[PDB]
Amino acid sequence: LPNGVAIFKCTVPNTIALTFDDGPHIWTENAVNQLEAAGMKGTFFLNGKNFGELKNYVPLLKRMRANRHQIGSHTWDHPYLTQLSDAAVRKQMTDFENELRRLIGYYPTYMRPPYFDYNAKTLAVMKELGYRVIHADLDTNDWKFDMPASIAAFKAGVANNRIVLAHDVHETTVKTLLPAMIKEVQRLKLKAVTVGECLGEPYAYWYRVTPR
Ligand SMILES: [Zn+2]
């Protein structure tokens, strides 16, 4: 896998990656329990401070890492990265790294730009930092709070699009959309794995430990 190149699709056959942005927050524990009860893994792109704060979810963050879900970076506090200087972009990343390594010991090598906002200057910062940049190809539009519409968009797009974007900070996403997504995955007999696994990259490459 290349660094600093937007990645849109899974490549490993039979695979699906349910991914979740903007957490952790008060519903994430619920979401993780749902995935584990069904034998599935999730990929969670977290912020340092947004809805919740990393330091308030240490046990959850530890189990996410130890149980082989995938933690990715969603920057420290969710700005439009194209509206920042290259130095502040880098600090949006390393600030997140430094807080995760202090609480659970690891920091990620995968990220998703907030609002999918990035240009050639954002990507070179990501390439210098060694990050895989994960977009998506199935947008559930779950932030509109239209659950019938979201569940239907998932069902219509799941055959060809396997990097599924949701936001686990919204109660409706966790209590309504996610059960519908898990059930449809079970019907289609797909393997709900992490984004790295769905790209052919195993656990040893999702994190770094030694500080920069
Ligand atoms: Zn976001």
Residue numbers in the entry: 35 to 246
Paper passage:
Phytopathogenic fungi secrete chitin deacetylase (CDA) to escape the host’s immunological defense during infection. Five crystal structures of two representative and phylogenetically distant phytopathogenic fungal CDAs, VdPDA1 from Verticillium dahliae and Pst_13661 from Puccinia striiformis f. sp. tritici, were obtained in ligand-free and inhibitor-bound forms. These structures suggested that both CDAs have an identical substrate-binding pocket and an Asp-His-His triad for coordinating a transition metal ion. Our findings revealed that phytopathogenic fungal CDAs share common structural features, and provided BHA as a lead compound for the design of CDA inhibitors aimed at attenuating crop fungal diseases.
Gao et al. showed that the cotton root pathogen Verticillium dahliae secretes a CDA (VdPDA1) that is specifically localized to fungus-host interfaces. VdPDA1 prevents CO-induced immune response reactive oxygen species (ROS) production, MAPK phosphorylation, and resistance-related gene expression. VdPDA1 and Pst_13661 are single-domain enzymes with 55% sequence similarity. The substrate-binding grooves of VdPDA1 and Pst_13661 are short and open-ended. Both enzymes adopt a classic (β/α)7 fold. In the structure of VdPDA1, the signature Asp-His-His triad (formed by Asp56, His108 and His112) and a water molecule were coordinate with a metal ion. Kinetic studies also indicated that both VdPDA1 and Pst_13661 used the Zn2+ ion instead of the Ni2+ ion for their higher activity. The mutant VdPDA1D55A, H201A, which completely lost its deacetylase activity, was constructed. Using VdPDA1 as a model, we showed that the catalytic residue-mutated strain VdΔpda1/cPDA1D55A, H201A could not evade host plant defenses, suggesting that the deacetylase activity of fungal CDAs is crucial for full virulence.
